[PDB]
Subunit: 207 residues, 3 copies
């Protein structure tokens, strides 16, 4: 019985030792899993996580998904409004422009035609387009604001008008002085005080 | 020996107790790892997973990668075909248009010129362009279908023609009535029954 | 005491057995965690990982983020340079072009006008624009190289000029023969040896 107990004790010792080795294996295996690189992955914008789902956040004016990342899903608009333009050099006059702005994705294309005459005093005129001078400002006013990248440079503008019964047309340029205001510069077809009529302006911006 | 066995038993008890505490530590540590947030991350379109690899799925007509996400990789096409256009108001006639469609990324730019005369009966005419009236329909017909976003609005179209030995040219507008059919509306340069010739149409769509 | 030791031994055996079952549970639970799918996720371009952060890598000429993935952030440029163009069929002459290149995102729009006369010998002329013939090559020369996708096709070019006191204007086409060289083809308004002047070229490329 002392001998029987001693044999039982030797058996227990063996089992305890097995358990001890199984616990050392589990300790190593759990050490790995605690350090696995994929734990604490995070996602910077335009990637985001909500309830375990990783998403690409998409500006619908620029892109969308149809399985794959493709172009804009937002509805195009053709806005129609009146914009009073201001002579800001070579003219102190104003002129009403009937404006169609075709907004498709983040491109806004302007087609403008004037009503009335603009009095000019020099051979070149600067004509300013400030969002505050728009009558019945559209809802999606964001469609009329150029992006910061677009604003950094002058952009091409087609201009045409009549003066003293003759048509003039020029490839000219505009530039934004701020996010709400651009000015175009164009020749007036002559010198001195005169009136130009049937002013048309065609240009486009990236918003 | 009873005393020796009792000392051995006290030693085993101590070892069993250590094992027990090592197992409680492992149980807590495994509880953490079972709940780690990064487990069961999923990826919604345009993101996808295949064999552990997370990818951005890219429409090659819109974007591609050159390390960074950049613009289209698909080859531009210049398609040339004949499109029979239909007078649908102010005309019951038809006219064959020779069409160059310049497809670059998801922009398709149309340059059309007519062969023949179109009989008009009013001062304004509606001219319809249905994909079914294209002769030798191109392979990439998808390049001639506007996106849902683009279809939501009228879009600018340049039109010019001759009538009674005089040129006319107008900035006009088209609109899609369905994904396969657009109609342009333009003045005819006069009134009554007449024939216009040398019709040219320039416009573009987002696909 | 033999009986007391035997009772202690039976108690230890019970504890060892509990420990053994707790270790088998932990072994199974650790087996799961070792195989979890989210372990060893990787990210293919334009997705990337740095220090646990997953990012969308963005070409700033094409896209940016303002929370959501939107259009370009790079500053637009209006470049002005002189490009000597080469007659390469129907002319052996050269002509200096004053070029405005409006670079907005990955679109580059060219507005060119000539200084001088170009001698032509046929009714059609090919005029070549090689980046090596640009005087004072701009810094961002990449803005003048079409993308591989754009190069695959001919593209529309507007051309106008004067010849013998009369204006001519044509919708024409260019094509890249390599990434640095495009040629435009246009009618010369007549036949035989003559001089054209006031050449203007308007076209655009995707870069
Ligand atoms: Cl004993
Ligand atoms: Cl144990
Ligand atoms: Zn013995
Ligand atoms: Zn894990
Ligand atoms: Zn006034
Ligand atoms: Zn003792
Ligand atoms: Zn007919
Ligand atoms: Zn007993
Ligand atoms: Zn020469």
């Amino acid at each position: 019985t002392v001998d029987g107990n001693s044999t039982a004790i030797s058996n227990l010792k063996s089992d305890i030792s097995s358990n001890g080795l199984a616990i050392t294996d589990l300790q190593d295996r759990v050490k790995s899993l605690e350090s696995t690189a994929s734990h604490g992955l995070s996602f910077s914008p335009p990637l985001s996580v909500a309830d375990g789902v990783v998403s690409l956040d998409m500006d619908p004016y620029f892109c969308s998904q149809r399985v794959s990342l493709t172009s804009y899903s937002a509805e195009a608009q053709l806005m129609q409004f009146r914009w009073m333009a201001r002579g800001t050099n070579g003219s102190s006059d104003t002129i009403d422009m009937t404006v169609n702005a075709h907004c498709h994705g983040r491109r806004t294309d302007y087609m403008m035609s004037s009503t009335g005459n603009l009095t000019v005093t020099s051979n070149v005129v600067l004509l300013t387009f400030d969002l505050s001078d728009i009558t019945h400002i559209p809802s999606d006013l964001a469609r009329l604001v150029p992006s910061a990248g677009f604003q950094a440079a002058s952009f091409p503008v087609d201009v045409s008008f009549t003066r003293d019964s003759a048509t003039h047309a020029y490839q000219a340029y505009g530039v934004y002085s701020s996010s709400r205001v651009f000015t175009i510069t164009f020749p007036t077809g002559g010198d001195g005080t005169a009136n130009i009529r049937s002013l048309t302006v065609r240009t486009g911006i990236d918003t």
